[PDB]
Design an enzyme around this catalytic site. Structure first.
Site, PDB file in Angstrom:
ATOM      1  N   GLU A 126       0.798  -1.221   0.000  1.00  0.00           N
ATOM      2  CA  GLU A 126       0.000   0.000   0.000  1.00  0.00           C
ATOM      3  C   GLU A 126       0.833   1.276   0.000  1.00  0.00           C
ATOM      4  OE1 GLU A 126      -2.335  -1.263   3.290  1.00  0.00           O
ATOM      5  OE2 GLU A 126      -4.050  -1.873   2.036  1.00  0.00           O
TER       6      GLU A 126
ATOM      7  N   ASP B 213     -12.248  -6.004  -3.051  1.00  0.00           N
ATOM      8  CA  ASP B 213     -13.058  -7.217  -2.973  1.00  0.00           C
ATOM      9  C   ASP B 213     -14.405  -6.898  -2.348  1.00  0.00           C
ATOM     10  OD1 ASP B 213     -12.971  -8.055   0.134  1.00  0.00           O
ATOM     11  OD2 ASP B 213     -10.974  -7.360  -0.460  1.00  0.00           O
TER      12      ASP B 213
HETATM   13  N1  LIG Z   1      -3.302 -11.271   1.939  1.00  0.00           N
HETATM   14  C1  LIG Z   1      -2.480 -10.744   3.036  1.00  0.00           C
HETATM   15  C2  LIG Z   1      -3.413 -10.363   4.222  1.00  0.00           C
HETATM   16  C3  LIG Z   1      -4.287  -9.179   3.837  1.00  0.00           C
HETATM   17  S1  LIG Z   1      -5.335  -8.734   5.281  1.00  0.00           S
HETATM   18  C4  LIG Z   1      -6.216  -7.305   4.526  1.00  0.00           C
HETATM   19  C5  LIG Z   1      -5.369  -6.020   4.568  1.00  0.00           C
HETATM   20  O1  LIG Z   1      -5.755  -5.134   3.499  1.00  0.00           O
HETATM   21  C6  LIG Z   1      -6.316  -3.918   4.000  1.00  0.00           C
HETATM   22  O2  LIG Z   1      -5.304  -2.893   4.139  1.00  0.00           O
HETATM   23  C7  LIG Z   1      -6.849  -4.349   5.407  1.00  0.00           C
HETATM   24  O3  LIG Z   1      -7.061  -3.269   6.251  1.00  0.00           O
HETATM   25  C8  LIG Z   1      -5.665  -5.216   5.868  1.00  0.00           C
HETATM   26  O4  LIG Z   1      -4.511  -4.468   6.102  1.00  0.00           O
HETATM   27  C9  LIG Z   1      -1.451 -11.827   3.526  1.00  0.00           C
HETATM   28  O5  LIG Z   1      -1.853 -13.003   3.435  1.00  0.00           O
HETATM   29  O6  LIG Z   1      -0.342 -11.442   3.948  1.00  0.00           O
HETATM   30  N1  LIG Z   2     -12.720  -8.179   3.165  1.00  0.00           N
HETATM   31  C1  LIG Z   2     -11.833  -7.487   3.896  1.00  0.00           C
HETATM   32  N2  LIG Z   2     -11.855  -7.607   5.243  1.00  0.00           N
HETATM   33  C2  LIG Z   2     -10.963  -6.907   5.962  1.00  0.00           C
HETATM   34  N3  LIG Z   2     -10.017  -6.071   5.537  1.00  0.00           N
HETATM   35  C3  LIG Z   2     -10.021  -5.972   4.194  1.00  0.00           C
HETATM   36  N4  LIG Z   2      -9.202  -5.212   3.376  1.00  0.00           N
HETATM   37  C4  LIG Z   2      -9.598  -5.457   2.102  1.00  0.00           C
HETATM   38  N5  LIG Z   2     -10.604  -6.298   2.020  1.00  0.00           N
HETATM   39  C5  LIG Z   2     -10.879  -6.629   3.331  1.00  0.00           C
END
Ligand SMILES: N[C@@H](CCSC[C@H]1O[C@H](O)[C@H](O)[C@@H]1O)C(=O)O
Ligand SMILES: Nc1ncnc2[nH]cnc12
Ligand SMILES: N[C@@H](CCSC[C@H]1O[C@H](O)[C@H](O)[C@@H]1O)C(=O)O
Ligand SMILES: Nc1ncnc2[nH]cnc12
Lengths: 231, 231
Positions: free
Chosen positions: A14, A199
Site C-alpha cells: 500500500e 473485494d
Molecule cells: N493477503 C495478506 C493479508 C491481507 S489482510 C487485509 C489487509 O488489506 C487492508 O489494508 C486491510 O485493512 C488489511 O490491512 C497476507 O496473506 O499477507
Molecule cells: N474483506 C476485507 N476484510 C478486511 N479487511 C479488508 N481489506 C480489504 N478487504 C478486506
C-alpha cells in the site's frame, strides 16, 4: 515550511506506490518495528510508513508518527472490502466515521462497538474529507463518503457482511482505519482515511484481494497524492 | 536513580489500589486521552496509568509510556477470566506468553492469531516472571505461569472458552495483555503481565466480575507492589 504530514498504509504494497508517486528522496528511520520514510515534497515534510496489518500494529505506528515525528495531520491510504452495491472494485471512499466492529462488551449490556470512556463512532476531518470530495468532483471520479468498519478479521462471508450493514450501516470493511482515526482523535491530529475497494468481503474475497491489491493500492495512493498537492 | 518503571492497568479500579499502596505524591500529567501519575518510590521513578479497556486503548497508552515518559520496564496489573480449573477466583498468574485470540486471517490460510510480519505468541520478561515466582513462593501463595489470551470481547460462554483452550492452550482471558506485551517487545522494553482471576469467563462471568473486581484488582496490585519492592 508547511505542515508535516504523516502518510500511512497497512501493508508494504500500500505504500510502495506512495513512495514512487511522490518521487523524492527518502531517509529510512527505524522505530518500534516500523520503518519511517522521511522526505520533503512541495515544501512539506512527509513521513511515510506501513504499520503492518490490524488494530494493534496500526495504533502503535500512528502513535509513533505523532509522538516521535510530530506529524500535524495523518492521511491513510489502502484497500478495503465493499459492503454496498454502489462501491465496486477500484472505487474510492473516504470514511466520515469509523467503528471497531469486533468490540463486544455486551455481557455488561453495552452496545456492540462501544467501550466505556469512549464512543462507538470515531470522527475524521471534515476539512480533509471535503477536500477529497472536491478533488474527486474535479477529476470526474466517484467518491463515497461513509462509515468504515474496522476489525482484526479479514471478512469473507455474507453473514458477517449483513451484520456490519445492519449494526453499523458500514459501507466498507478493513483492519486499520478505526484505530488510526482513534489515535489521531486522542492527540487532536486531523485525520483522513482513504480506501479503494479490492473485494466484496464475501466467500470469494481472498482471491479478489489477491487479484486487485496492486491496482486498488495504486488507485488510493494516486488519490492521496492528489490531496497532498492541494495541501 | 534506579530504573524508571511504567505501571499499567486497564480500568481506573485496577490502578486505584496501586496509587494507594505506593502511598507517595503523584503529579498528574495528561497525554493522548490518558492521565499519567508520576512519582518517586524507593529512588525509582514510577509512572502509573489506566489505559481504558481493550487493545487499541492499551496499545496507545503503552506506546505513550515508552515514547513520552521513557519507561525502562512495564508492569501490568489487573483482573482476568479463568480458563483452567486450577485458577480460582483471586488466584494470580503471570503471562509467560500472550496471544491475540480474536485475530483471524484464515481467509488467506494463516493460523488463527497470526498476522504477517508478526507471530502468534508474544514473549514477556523471563527475569520479571522468575522474580514473581520467587516472591510468590516466599509469600506462600500460588502463582500460575501460563498463556494469556487477549481480545476485544468480554468472554462469557463455554463455546469461546473451549476455543481458547483448544486453539491456544490459554490459562486466562482478558482484553489488554497481548497488546501491552506486544508494544513492549517492539521497543525492547521488559514487560510483565500480572492478573488476578475475577470470574470464569462463562455465562455468569458478568456478575462474578462485578462481585470480585475490587478484591481481585487489589490482590494483583499488592503483588505488583511486592515486585517493585524487589526491583
Ligand atoms: N493477503 C495478506 C493479508 C491481507 S489482510 C487485509 C489487509 O488489506 C487492508 O489494508 C486491510 O485493512 C488489511 O490491512 C497476507 O496473506 O499477507
Ligand atoms: N474483506 C476485507 N476484510 C478486511 N479487511 C479488508 N481489506 C480489504 N478487504 C478486506
Ligand atoms: N464491567 C466493565 C467492563 C469490564 S471489561 C473487562 C476488563 O477487565 C479486565 O481488565 C479486562 O482486560 C478488561 O479491561 C464496564 O461495564 O464498564
Ligand atoms: N471473562 C473475561 N473476558 C475478558 N476480559 C476479562 N477480564 C476479566 N474477566 C474477563
Amino acid at each position: 515550511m508547511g505542515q508535516k504530514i504523516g502518510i500511512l498504509g497497512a501493508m508494504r504494497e500500500e505504500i510502495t506506490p506512495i513512495l514512487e508517486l511522490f518521487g523524492v528522496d527518502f531517509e529510512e528511520i527505524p522505530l518500534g518495528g516500523n520503518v519511517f520514510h522521511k522526505g520533503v515534497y512541495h515544501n512539506k515534510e512527509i513521513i511515510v510508513a506501513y504499520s503492518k496489518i490490524g488494530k494493534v500494529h496500526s495504533t502503535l505506528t500512528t502513535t509513533s508518527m505523532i509522538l516521535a515525528f510530530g506529524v500535524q495531520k495523518v492521511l491513510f491510504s489502502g484497500v478495503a472490502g465493499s459492503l454496498v452495491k454502489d462501491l465496486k472494485i477500484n472505487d474510492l471512499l473516504v470514511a466520515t466515521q469509523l467503528v471497531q466492529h469486533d468490540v463486544d462488551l455486551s455481557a455488561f449490556d453495552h452496545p456492540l462497538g462501544f467501550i466505556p470512556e469512549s464512543a462507538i463512532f470515531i470522527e475524521t476531518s471534515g476539512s480533509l474529507n471535503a477536500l477529497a470530495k472536491k478533488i474527486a468532483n474535479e477529476q470526474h471520479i466517484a467518491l463515497k463518503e461513509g462509515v468504515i468498519a474496522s476489525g482484526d478479521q479479514f471478512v469473507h462471508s455474507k453473514e458477517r457482511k449483513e451484520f456490519l450493514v445492519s449494526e453499523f450501516k458500514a459501507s466498507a470493511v478493513e483492519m486499520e482505519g478505526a484505530s488510526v482515526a482513534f489515535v489521531c482523535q486522542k492527540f487532536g491530529v486531523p485525520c483522513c482515511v482513504l480506501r479503494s475497494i479490492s473485494d466484496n468481503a464475501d466467500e470469494k474475497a481472498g482471491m479478489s484481494f489477491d487479484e486487485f491489491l496492486e491496482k486498488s493500492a495504486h488507485t488510493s495512493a494516486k488519490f492521496l497524492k492528489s490531496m497532498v498537492d492541494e495541501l
